[PDB]
Design a binder for this molecule. Structure first.
Ligand SMILES: Cc1cc2nc3c(=O)[nH]c(=O)nc-3n(C[C@H](O)[C@H](O)[C@H](O)COP(=O)(O)O)c2cc1C
Ligand SMILES: CC(=O)Nc1ccc([C@H](O)C2CCCCC2)cc1
Ligand SMILES: O=C(O)c1cc(=O)[nH]c(=O)[nH]1
Ligand SMILES: [Cl-]
Ligand SMILES: [Cl-]
Length: 363
């Protein structure tokens, strides 16, 4: 009903009128004001997950990039997301790359983007989170946590110091922090996933984090690329277990262009998201879960647009999942649809809940 109206009528009209960045800006604006109707789906108890020192009412979150600046957090919970990740946020304000910088590939159910960390900056985001801070403390207690994804300024010399600044400013306002070292659109950023660079970076991050007061102390997760060599992945797993990193977000967008893409804009520079990323992302979750012996919580992200997609990542090793690109094609009804189908699939496969399904393929 509502799924068909968005998918077949409203979204093709929106795509026909507005460029993808303009449509994104309108989506953030409409979501922030609460103009969308409240999600009718009540989450069952079997969707509840306990991870990262928090209850999650459902395991389906909004991935970083949709709400870069912390403008639409409450509207995103109203849509039925079990958790919200804002960002990436850089220390100073910066504009990002020149337009055009977002591209639809509707034949692939994919997006390519090269935003380049457009960000209002830490100070603006700080004050915005402060204004609704006690509302968030209640939401978190009710099972609706907030993640903050940290990035690096384009012109910064010391990358670790950009991330350190992010921990000090927004760590107190977050349930979890994400060290994004996997954007394909900032020069040299993915080099930070290498063993020695990563160990130095995360030592400094965890130290800054441990210096926060206990009640204001977030979990620290590392967000990784889907384009890593076997050597890179094994090295990340090692660094993560050595330092006691709280989790992994698996994965960012891909710089690959899989055989079979049909979209006219497939050769645009940027990160590819959506359906062509999906199995590449699931396999990365599979490998990272095995290398970490199932002891490091994974948030699974990349081409989730259904209950099956979510459950494949969960079973591969993900404790929670995120989606973004699916929202650009199917609209807000995708959130309810993913959760409803997940719940049905868990019952069909003999799982009492999400928790029982996590890493089930490895057993
Ligand atoms: C327009 C756009 C902007 C994004 N911005 C960010 C970002 O700022 N930080 C980040 O860590 N990931 C970012 N991502 C990556 C997503 O969070 C996610 O990892 C990826 O798109 C795979 O999920 P999906 O297939 O559901 O989109 C962005 C993705 C898109 C499509
Ligand atoms: C790149 C990007 O972010 N594109 C995007 C496009 C559409 C939407 C929303 O589904 C749509 C809901 C109803 C109001 C219009 C916006 C979200 C993201
Ligand atoms: O801002 C961006 O360009 C961006 C960041 C990121 O982490 N991932 C992505 O696909 N785009
Ligand atoms: Cl590079
Ligand atoms: Cl390899």
């Amino acid at each position: 009903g509502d799924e068909r109206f968005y998918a077949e009528h409203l979204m093709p009209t929106l795509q026909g009128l507005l460029d993808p960045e303009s449509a994104h800006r309108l989506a953030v604006r409409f979501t922030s004001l609460g103009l969308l109707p409240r999600a009718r789906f009540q989450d069952s108890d079997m969707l509840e997950v306990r991870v990262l020192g928090h209850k999650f009412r459902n395991p389906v979150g909004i991935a970083a990039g949709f709400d870069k600046h912390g403008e639409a957090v409450d509207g995103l919970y109203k849509m039925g997301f079990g958790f919200v990740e804002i960002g990436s946020v850089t220390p100073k304000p910066q504009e990002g790359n020149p337009r055009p910088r977002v591209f639809r590939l509707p034949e692939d159910q994919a997006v390519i983007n090269r935003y380049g960390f457009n960000s209002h900056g830490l100070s603006v985001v700080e004050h915005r989170l402060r204004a609704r801070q006690q509302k968030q403390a209640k939401l978190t207690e009710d099972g609706l946590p907030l993640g903050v994804n940290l990035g690096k300024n384009k012109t910064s010399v010391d990358a670790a110091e950009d991330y350190a600044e992010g921990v000090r400013v927004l760590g107190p306002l977050a349930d979890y922090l994400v060290v994004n070292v996997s954007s394909p659109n900032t020069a040299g950023l993915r080099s930070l996933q290498g063993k020695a660079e990563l160990r130095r970076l995360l030592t400094k991050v965890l130290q800054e984090r441990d210096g926060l007061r206990r009640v204001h102390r977030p979990a620290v997760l590392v967000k990784i690329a889907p384009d890593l060599t076997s050597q890179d992945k094994e090295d990340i797993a090692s660094v993560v277990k050595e330092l006691g990193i709280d989790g992994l977000i698996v994965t960012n967008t891909t710089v690959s262009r899989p055989a079979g893409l049909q979209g006219a804009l497939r050769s645009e520079t940027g990160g590819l998201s959506g359906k062509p990323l999906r199995d590449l992302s699931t396999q990365t979750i599979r490998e990272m879960y095995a290398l970490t012996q199932g002891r490091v919580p994974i948030i699974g992200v990349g081409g989730v647009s259904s209950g099956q997609d979510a459950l494949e990542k969960i079973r591969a090793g993900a404790s929670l999942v995120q989606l973004y690109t699916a929202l650009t094609f199917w609209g807000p009804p995708v959130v309810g649809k993913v959760k409803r189908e997940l719940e049905a699939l868990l019952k069909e496969q003999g799982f009492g809940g999400v928790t029982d399904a996590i890493g089930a393929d490895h057993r």
